[PDB]
Amino acid sequence: ADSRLPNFRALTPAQRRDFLADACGLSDAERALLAAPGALPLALADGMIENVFGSFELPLGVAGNFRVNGRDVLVPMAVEEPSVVAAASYMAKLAREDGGFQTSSTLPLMRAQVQVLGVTDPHGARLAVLQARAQIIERANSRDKVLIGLGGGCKDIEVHVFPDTPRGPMLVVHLIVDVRDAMGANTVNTMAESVAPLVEKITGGSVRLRILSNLADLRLARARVRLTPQTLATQDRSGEEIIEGVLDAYTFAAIDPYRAATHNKGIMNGIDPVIVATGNDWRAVEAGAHAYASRSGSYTSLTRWEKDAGGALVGSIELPMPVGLVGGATKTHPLARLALKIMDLQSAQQLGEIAAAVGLAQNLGALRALATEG
Amino acid sequence: ADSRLPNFRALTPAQRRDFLADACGLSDAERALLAAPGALPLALADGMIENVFGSFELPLGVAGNFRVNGRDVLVPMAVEEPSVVAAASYMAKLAREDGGFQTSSTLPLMRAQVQVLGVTDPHGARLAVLQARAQIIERANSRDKVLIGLGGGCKDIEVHVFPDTPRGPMLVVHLIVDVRDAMGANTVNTMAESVAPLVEKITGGSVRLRILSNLADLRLARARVRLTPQTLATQDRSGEEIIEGVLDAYTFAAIDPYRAATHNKGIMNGIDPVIVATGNDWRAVEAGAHAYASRSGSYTSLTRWEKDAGGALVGSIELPMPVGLVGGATKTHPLARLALKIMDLQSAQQLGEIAAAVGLAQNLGALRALATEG
Ligand SMILES: OC[C@H]1O[C@@](CO)(O[C@H]2O[C@H](CO)[C@@H](O)[C@H](O)[C@H]2O)[C@@H](O)[C@@H]1O
Ligand SMILES: OC[C@H]1O[C@@](CO)(O[C@H]2O[C@H](CO)[C@@H](O)[C@H](O)[C@H]2O)[C@@H](O)[C@@H]1O
Ligand SMILES: OC[C@H]1O[C@@](CO)(O[C@H]2O[C@H](CO)[C@@H](O)[C@H](O)[C@H]2O)[C@@H](O)[C@@H]1O
Ligand SMILES: OC[C@H]1O[C@@](CO)(O[C@H]2O[C@H](CO)[C@@H](O)[C@H](O)[C@H]2O)[C@@H](O)[C@@H]1O
Ligand SMILES: C[C@@](O)(CCO)CC(=O)[O-]
Ligand SMILES: C[C@@](O)(CCO)CC(=O)[O-]
């Protein structure tokens, strides 16, 4: 795998398509799918959403130079905004000097909420539910033998109590579910329905909402990058001066929600187009990201930018990354399947790690540009 | 204008396209633009983003029944997820019984941040900047005579001081700019550059970031809906019982960020597809919405659901809505221009009000469905 895109600025879209097809070993059918419009015929689109009367195209670009955990990866991006793809590619190029991005993730754990009303002893009922955790987990896992055979399934539960609300006390059971390579919404929603009668029997209450949480803070992707001063040096500015400017811009985002919103928007300029191009749900990724950014009690930066003891710039990101390689549009849309092949994805976790790296690079591109503007 | 879509579930995409073309008075060229793929040829896409090698289609559906401030409006939605378009259409149909949605907006005011470093008396320098507000406003307005002739331009300034940061004191000037029918990013970024030398002269400091804020809390859209119990009644449930279930679900989102993230995600299922279909920047709308949802110090619901004194369900939303009718992809993409024509838009404010109404309806659809699931 080689993610370098020599002279791509000067090539036509057809020439870029042919280069990508050669670099990724795309089949003749896959090349033809890209060479004509309408890779998603209306008959297919008609089965995806309601009241279909057409299709709507986003430009599809490729960000170059990315290397993640030692592996080059080409990154498709479906987006309408200028400068985004070029900035991601340029920051990835600089990241290559330190060996690229380094990433990790948690297990692919999604939360399903089971909201219980009518329980007047919710703290005591919480203990009864926790004592019965094995029975609840077994009930959650009793229908999806395929997921369990892959090593997924419900792994744990939590119980949260809201003893005083305008609607009375609420007891909320969270099922913690390993969803493997799925985004997980339908999987965990079905388990929440499955456990509802047992939860009602234990608590004596009435189950209302049975629904995933998009605050997917048990399904985190992490990415780190390090750039020395010499890597960041330009004709006009020392790398040291650029590093100090990035830190100035980062601290501004850390302390001021008015800046943090724009700073994090820039991250999502990198992440969302990868989500879209792979057929994933961009609203879910946006909600998890921005809700996680508020976890401390103030809306703040999702990234951290620092200087290590030797003076190099170090960037880091950690954020929920609920994405899948199966199900939804990722299965039905022929170009989403092609995007997965271009990226050579082995797991949904890997897709999330790559997306986090792209968001981190995008953020660096914005901070480096804004801090070096004369 | 009539936004009812009779028997749309049973029509083919071609039949739906022809109905919409007839209802909206679309030209023959516009009808043909929808009837074949590739409304955005690669030569056009190639000028929008970098490294273009293709295009990526989202299904394009239409939500029916919406009526906003007494005017029916058909709502294009570019999205990949099932159930979304049908739920928006169904909730809009119920809203028609009370006359539809009622909306308002603030002036289209965007913030540009001018970050000043090196000022050791930032509180005193803030006063010097405020005393010079007229001169700063005149400088901001000196280049864009067209915007000013439309009644736009910089209208006010604020100054915020962060006296103790890891990077030293920061003084941040906000330019408050009426951007008329533009999203406003380039407009306000240019004004921030224009005022930087004058701000440096007044404060003695050094300007670093000159950049819009995506926390666009001076550019708000508001939407309200009211539904009586008889409107919400179904074969299986009284409207009264459904209303109580919606309130139960709403309070859950108000008090628990794990639920609020999913609740607000549902809002963005309605809003974002309209943003995409009109060529607008969906990352900007997402960032403003979710950052605003954290303004109270906890991540919470963007909507409010209540019962009025007579027992009717009342929903309300207020959120930043930075959208445009001009500039960006909204000008270049032929289908984005067609979307504006389908919606018969008179201003960017109106687009924002319609989008807020769609988000409110989408939220109602999710809460009503989740609360009435057996
Ligand atoms: O992993 C090697 C070893 O080197 C350290 C520095 O002591 O990290 C360096 O190597 C990493 C692997 O490429 C880089 O990601 C990092 O930027 C670089 O400093 C240790 O952290 C690590 O144990
Ligand atoms: O696959 C999950 C499991 O594999 C490990 C082994 O190192 O990580 C592999 O897959 C991850 C997802 O891309 C990468 O972060 C990692 O580099 C790769 O070796 C474990 O980290 C993880 O538990
Ligand atoms: O605007 C009319 C007048 O009626 C009130 C109720 O007293 O609101 C009703 O009419 C509105 C306009 O259609 C509806 O939006 C609202 O739902 C309905 O109650 C007053 O608020 C208003 O002044
Ligand atoms: O156009 C802004 C200006 O017009 C008013 C007049 O009522 O509102 C008009 O346009 C708004 C945007 O769609 C609508 O909310 C309103 O219904 C419509 O009459 C003022 O509200 C506003 O200051
Ligand atoms: C450049 C930026 O505004 C994104 C442009 O869409 C992000 C940022 O300011 O960090
Ligand atoms: C139904 C919902 O999960 C959106 C589905 O994408 C939103 C919600 O739970 O309110």
Side-chain angles (χ1 to χ4, degrees), chain A residues 81 259 262-263 265-266 269 366-367 370, chain B residues 211-212 281:
Chain A
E81 180 180 358
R259 174 60 195 154
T262 316
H263 175 104
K265 193 280 198 187
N269 279 349
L367 269 42
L370 287 169
Chain B
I211 181 71
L212 88 158
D281 180 332

Short mmCIF file of all heavy atoms in Angstrom, two decimals, chain A residues 81 259 262-263 265-266 269 366-367 370, chain B residues 211-212 281, ligand 5:
data_model
loop_
_atom_site.label_atom_id
_atom_site.label_comp_id
_atom_site.label_asym_id
_atom_site.label_seq_id
_atom_site.Cartn_x
_atom_site.Cartn_y
_atom_site.Cartn_z
N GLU A 81 -16.80 21.40 0.28
CA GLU A 81 -16.09 22.61 0.68
C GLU A 81 -14.66 22.62 0.17
O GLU A 81 -13.91 21.65 0.39
CB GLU A 81 -16.07 22.70 2.21
CG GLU A 81 -15.35 23.95 2.73
CD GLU A 81 -15.31 24.06 4.24
OE1 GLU A 81 -15.88 23.20 4.95
OE2 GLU A 81 -14.71 25.04 4.73
N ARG A 259 -14.62 29.74 20.21
CA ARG A 259 -13.56 29.23 19.35
C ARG A 259 -13.62 27.71 19.24
O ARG A 259 -13.41 27.16 18.16
CB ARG A 259 -12.19 29.69 19.87
CG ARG A 259 -11.01 29.10 19.12
CD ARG A 259 -11.03 29.45 17.64
NE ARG A 259 -10.10 28.60 16.91
CZ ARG A 259 -10.20 28.29 15.62
NH1 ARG A 259 -11.18 28.80 14.88
NH2 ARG A 259 -9.30 27.48 15.06
N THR A 262 -15.71 26.29 16.37
CA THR A 262 -15.10 26.40 15.05
C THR A 262 -13.95 25.41 14.91
O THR A 262 -13.79 24.76 13.88
CB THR A 262 -14.57 27.82 14.90
OG1 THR A 262 -15.55 28.74 15.39
CG2 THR A 262 -14.25 28.14 13.44
N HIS A 263 -13.14 25.31 15.97
CA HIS A 263 -12.05 24.35 16.05
C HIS A 263 -12.56 22.93 15.83
O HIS A 263 -12.04 22.18 15.00
CB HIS A 263 -11.43 24.56 17.44
CG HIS A 263 -10.35 23.61 17.82
ND1 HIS A 263 -9.01 23.97 17.82
CD2 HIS A 263 -10.40 22.36 18.33
CE1 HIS A 263 -8.29 22.97 18.27
NE2 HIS A 263 -9.10 21.98 18.59
N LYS A 265 -15.53 22.06 14.54
CA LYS A 265 -16.08 22.02 13.18
C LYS A 265 -15.00 21.61 12.18
O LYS A 265 -15.25 20.79 11.29
CB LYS A 265 -16.67 23.39 12.83
CG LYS A 265 -17.55 23.42 11.57
CD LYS A 265 -16.75 23.47 10.27
CE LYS A 265 -17.63 23.93 9.11
NZ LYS A 265 -16.92 23.83 7.80
N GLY A 266 -13.80 22.17 12.33
CA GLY A 266 -12.70 21.81 11.44
C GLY A 266 -12.34 20.34 11.53
O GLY A 266 -12.01 19.71 10.53
N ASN A 269 -14.87 18.53 9.48
CA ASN A 269 -14.57 18.64 8.05
C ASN A 269 -13.73 17.46 7.56
O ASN A 269 -13.81 17.10 6.39
CB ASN A 269 -13.78 19.91 7.74
CG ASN A 269 -14.64 21.16 7.63
OD1 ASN A 269 -15.87 21.11 7.57
ND2 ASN A 269 -13.98 22.31 7.61
N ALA A 366 -5.95 23.50 9.85
CA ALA A 366 -6.63 24.75 10.14
C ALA A 366 -5.82 25.61 11.11
O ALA A 366 -5.67 26.82 10.89
CB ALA A 366 -8.02 24.48 10.71
N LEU A 367 -5.29 25.01 12.17
CA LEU A 367 -4.54 25.78 13.16
C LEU A 367 -3.24 26.31 12.58
O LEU A 367 -2.88 27.47 12.81
CB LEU A 367 -4.25 24.91 14.38
CG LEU A 367 -5.28 24.94 15.51
CD1 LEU A 367 -6.73 24.92 15.03
CD2 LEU A 367 -4.99 23.80 16.47
N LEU A 370 -4.21 29.20 10.12
CA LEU A 370 -4.70 30.40 10.80
C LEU A 370 -3.60 31.10 11.57
O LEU A 370 -3.61 32.33 11.67
CB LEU A 370 -5.84 30.03 11.76
CG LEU A 370 -7.19 29.65 11.16
CD1 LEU A 370 -8.10 29.04 12.24
CD2 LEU A 370 -7.86 30.86 10.50
N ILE B 211 -11.07 34.88 12.49
CA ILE B 211 -11.84 33.72 12.05
C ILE B 211 -13.25 33.80 12.62
O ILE B 211 -13.45 34.20 13.77
CB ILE B 211 -11.13 32.42 12.49
CG1 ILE B 211 -11.90 31.18 12.02
CG2 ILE B 211 -10.92 32.40 14.01
CD1 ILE B 211 -11.84 30.98 10.54
N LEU B 212 -14.23 33.37 11.82
CA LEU B 212 -15.60 33.31 12.30
C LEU B 212 -15.72 32.35 13.48
O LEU B 212 -14.90 31.44 13.69
CB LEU B 212 -16.54 32.82 11.19
CG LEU B 212 -16.73 31.31 11.04
CD1 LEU B 212 -18.04 30.98 10.32
CD2 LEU B 212 -15.54 30.68 10.34
N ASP B 281 -23.24 24.01 4.22
CA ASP B 281 -22.18 23.34 4.98
C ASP B 281 -22.80 22.67 6.21
O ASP B 281 -23.16 23.34 7.18
CB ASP B 281 -21.16 24.41 5.37
CG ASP B 281 -19.99 23.88 6.17
OD1 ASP B 281 -20.12 22.87 6.90
OD2 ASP B 281 -18.93 24.52 6.10
C1 LIG C 5 -10.86 26.69 9.15
C2 LIG C 5 -12.16 26.26 9.83
O1 LIG C 5 -12.95 27.39 10.08
C3 LIG C 5 -12.92 25.29 8.93
C4 LIG C 5 -13.39 25.90 7.61
O2 LIG C 5 -14.57 25.23 7.26
C5 LIG C 5 -11.89 25.50 11.12
C6 LIG C 5 -11.13 26.32 12.15
O3 LIG C 5 -11.25 27.56 12.23
O4 LIG C 5 -10.37 25.74 12.95
#
